[PDB]
Design a protein around this ligand. Structure first.
Ligand SMILES: Nc1ncnc2c1ncn2[C@@H]1O[C@H](COP(=O)(O)OP(=O)(O)NP(=O)(O)O)[C@@H](O)[C@H]1O
Ligand SMILES: [Zn+2]
Length: 748
DNA sequence: TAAACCAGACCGTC
């Protein structure tokens, strides 16, 4: 009636729907002694924390930083990440208490957690070293004190952009004695957002070199293929990489699971949801600490409900919690604390827990479908694993062509190294914005470089635009305006819809948040919102004021709605015809229609009703490049053509971010069989950004190279006929690669 | 697919 973790592994190993088993060997610690040049109080505080010797990567980090070489360390989960930058910083401040340090954290939550850990170690040390967070949530009263009292300042790239750099005169104390700059999640600063952050760091560099201090960069990265490369491109300093993980590891089983078949003629497999519910059932009933990742928020709530209902009989009510970003802050801090301290047995989470928050180590990880990227899969996997014991990671594939491809061909996943991080810090829009901010902070000499090389031409352009005035060889700010306040480092942002519960008007409370775009389908005027298994019904969605008023009624079902997406070219402004195709660049609009939502019983998963959603067709206006296929009378069948269009779309989504150095999400590639304005099959590439940010323009400009590199990728892909790294394994004839390549020929 | 962020200081009225 009680099975151990190893016994449960044995049961899984045999006679199952398992399709692959991958054993990751245990790794015993590799270590060096604590450098006894360290302050004795620091050694004692670390000895209390079980840190008597250092790991190889921690030691290498310390020595590298001690000599002044900038580092980027790839410290996995529970591998002593924090100490790599905490030891140099605390050492150097304990040496000369006039020293200071910047911590750059991608979120405010991680900033608060780092402040907490630093405060604990500082209290154990006994020296009056103050570490403050200066994010947006810092109340304006304490900000003045923090500027001139905080030895360690913990912020965002965002808050570095908007407040610290432009008021560098109010941060004198910090800037004159800046020895270290910590960047905690290098990989999250990629794509266009990384392009912005790069120029933010350039402005930080110029302020530092002005105030008389050249600090050294300590970066932490996830497992991306180019960590040193992204680190150098982002910091602009020579980066030396810390690869060798010297932390203790345990046996790790990484298993591919495929639901059984329930109707072979129609070839429908069981829900990955049901198999995951039952697997987490078996693991949590035996009190095994388990993380269960789900691809969407709704599936997170569904799996939470099912798992809790099936396991409450044996384990209890309060042992299993959910996790998604729309939760309240206090809620998420408590769930993190509970996963850490060991009083939460199971957690069902969105990808929000791929982010390196400290929830400790899990024993079992369950993936309800392939996350969508190799790096995300490996991140979800690294969330489980004891220091010495065993660990198990089950990836229950679903009915996705990509997931079933991983299942039919498991070597494909384990040979692909995780994705690369690409930024273009010389995007015209981004570089111009940040030049304006930098000039506002300090007058910029024309001959002096900004990152790569001289930028005097853009400075002439800026003087022409009444914004800069040129005195001598330096351009001064020539406008009463404040540039950094109207520039958003992640302008693909939004106001969020606040979820308010007017049940009793005596105690009306905010129960959560949700991005405006998602509220169209998850918080419509009769939606059901599930907040950690708690049922609410949206009474009314105030779209204009970003509010969703709900009540706590108890029903049997849950709502799901889908968005019909459209794309309409407004006007073509640049175009180039060819022998068989035509390539245009112009303005397009993407339209999202809420249409109707469906009611589905939670227990049976059967449709029990439908309803309308009366919301506006929300349209995004942006720029796009697109390719029209010219057809004669001798033309391909429509649906063979459509499948070929989908293949070309996949190949383009792979090649374009590589060529124009941006992220895969910075540009979408949509296929249309009969475009509305021409009737001709078309491939659209539009960057999803309110203002056209020039990705589609560069796609149009360098499109021939993109095309031929696409052909190159198709021919040098190791698969038979097709895989999800090229034409996407969903064309329904033989020799699909050849047809795709021929279409690429007619485009070239 | 989910998720994330944004002057310092003064002014005029409660
Ligand atoms: N030299 C050491 N000896 C013993 N334990 C150590 C040592 N260095 C680090 N640790 C342990 O490391 C644990 C947490 O590591 P940490 O510095 O937080 O990186 P991390 O867990 O990988 N960050 P994350 O990837 O977001 O989870 C603590 O519980 C420490 O006890
Ligand atoms: Zn392939």
């Amino acid at each position: 009636k009680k099975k151990s973790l190893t016994e449960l592994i044995s049961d899984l190993k045999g006679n199952e729907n398992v399709v692959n088993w991958h054993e990751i060997e245990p790794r015993e610690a590799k270590t060096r002694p604590m450098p006894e040049s360290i302050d004795e109080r620091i050694k004692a505080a670390l000895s209390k924390r079980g840190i008597d010797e250092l790991y190889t990567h921690q030691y290498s980090a310390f020595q590298y930083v001690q000599k002044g070489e900038s580092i980027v360390t790839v410290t996995p989960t529970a591998s002593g990440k924090t100490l790599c930058y905490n030891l140099p910083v605390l050492q150097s401040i304990a040496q000369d208490e006039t020293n200071r340090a910047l911590y750059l954290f991608p979120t405010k939550a991680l900033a608060q957690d780092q402040k907490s850990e630093l405060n604990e170690i500082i209290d154990e040390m006994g020296i009056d070293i103050k570490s403050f967070t200066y994010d947006g949530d810092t109340s304006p009263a304490i900000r003045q004190k923090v500027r001139k009292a905080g030895h360690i300042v913990i912020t965002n790239p965002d808050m570095l952009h908007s407040a610290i750099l432009p008021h560098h005169t109010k941060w004198v104390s910090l800037f004159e004695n800046l020895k270290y700059i910590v960047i905690d999640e290098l990989h999250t600063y990629r794509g266009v957002f990384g392009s912005h952050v790069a120029n933010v760091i350039r402005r930080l560099k110029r302020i530092c070199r002005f105030y008389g201090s050249d600090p050294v960069f300590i970066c932490t990265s996830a497992t991306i293929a180019n960590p040193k490369e992204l680190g150098e491109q982002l910091t602009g300093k020579p980066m030396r990489l810390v690869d060798d993980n010297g932390a203790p590891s345990g046996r790790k089983h990484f298993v591919f699971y495929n639901p059984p078949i329930v109707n072979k003629p129609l070839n429908i497999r069981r829900s990955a949801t049901a198999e995951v519910n039952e697997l987490a059932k078996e693991f949590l009933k035996n009190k095994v600490q388990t993380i269960v990742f789900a691809r969407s928020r709704v599936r997170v709530e569904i799996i939470l409900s099912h798992i809790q209902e099936l396991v409450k009989k044996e384990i209890g009510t309060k042992s299993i919690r959910g996790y998604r970003g729309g939760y309240l802050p206090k809620e998420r801090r408590e769930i993190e604390r509970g996963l850490r301290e060991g009083d939460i047995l199971g957690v069902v989470s969105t990808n929000a827990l791929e982010l390196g928050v400290d929830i400790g180590q899990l024993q079992v990880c369950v993936m309800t479908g392939y996350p969508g990227s190799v790096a995300s899969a490996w991140q979800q996997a690294g969330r489980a694993g004891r220091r010495h014991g065993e660990s198990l990671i089950i990836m229950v594939a679903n009915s996705t062509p990509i997931d079933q491809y991983i299942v039919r061909h498991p070597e494909y996943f384990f040979n692909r190294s995780p994705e690369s991080a690409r930024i273009n810090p010389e995007n015209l829009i981004i570089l111009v914005d940040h030049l304006k901010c930098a000039a506002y902070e300090l007058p910029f000499r024309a001959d002096e470089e900004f990152g790569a090389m001289e930028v005097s031409d853009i400075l002439e352009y800026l003087q022409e635009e009444a914004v800069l005035h040129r005195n001598g060889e330096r351009y001064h700010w020539a406008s009463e305006s404040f540039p950094a306040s109207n520039i958003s480092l992640r302008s693909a942002s939004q106001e969020n819809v606040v979820i308010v519960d007017q049940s009793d008007i005596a105690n009306v409370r905010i129960i959560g948040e949700m991005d405006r775009f998602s509220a169209m389908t998850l918080l419509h005027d009769e939606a059901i919102y599930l907040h950690e298994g708690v049922q609410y019904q949206v009474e009314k969605l105030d779209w204009d004021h970003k509010k969703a008023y709900v009540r706590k009624v108890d029903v049997e079902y849950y709502t799901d709605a889908n968005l019909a997406v459209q794309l309409k070219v407004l006007e073509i402004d640049k175009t180039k015809e060819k022998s068989r195709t035509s390539l245009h660049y112009g303005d397009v609009t993407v339209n999202a229609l809420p249409t109707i939502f469906k009611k589905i019983k939670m227990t049976t998963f059967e449709n029990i009703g439908s309803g309308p959603i009366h919301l506006p067709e929300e349209e995004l206006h942006t720029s796009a490049a697109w390719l029209e296929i010219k057809t004669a009378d001798e033309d391909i069948g429509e649906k063979t053509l459509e499948q070929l269009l989908l293949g070309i779309s996949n190949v383009l989504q792979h090649i374009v971010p590589v060529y124009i150095m941006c992220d895969r999400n910075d540009v979408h590639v949509v296929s249309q069989i009969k475009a509305a304005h021409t009737g001709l099959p078309t491939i659209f590439l539009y960057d999803h950004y309110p203002g056209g940010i020039g990705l589609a323009e560069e796609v149009f400009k360098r499109f021939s190279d993109i095309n031929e590199a696409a052909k190159q990728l198709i021919t040098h892909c190791p698969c038979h006929d097709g895989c999800p790294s090229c034409i996407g394994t969903e064309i329904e004839g033989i020799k699909a690669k050849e047809r795709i390549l021929q279409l690429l020929d007619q485009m070239s």
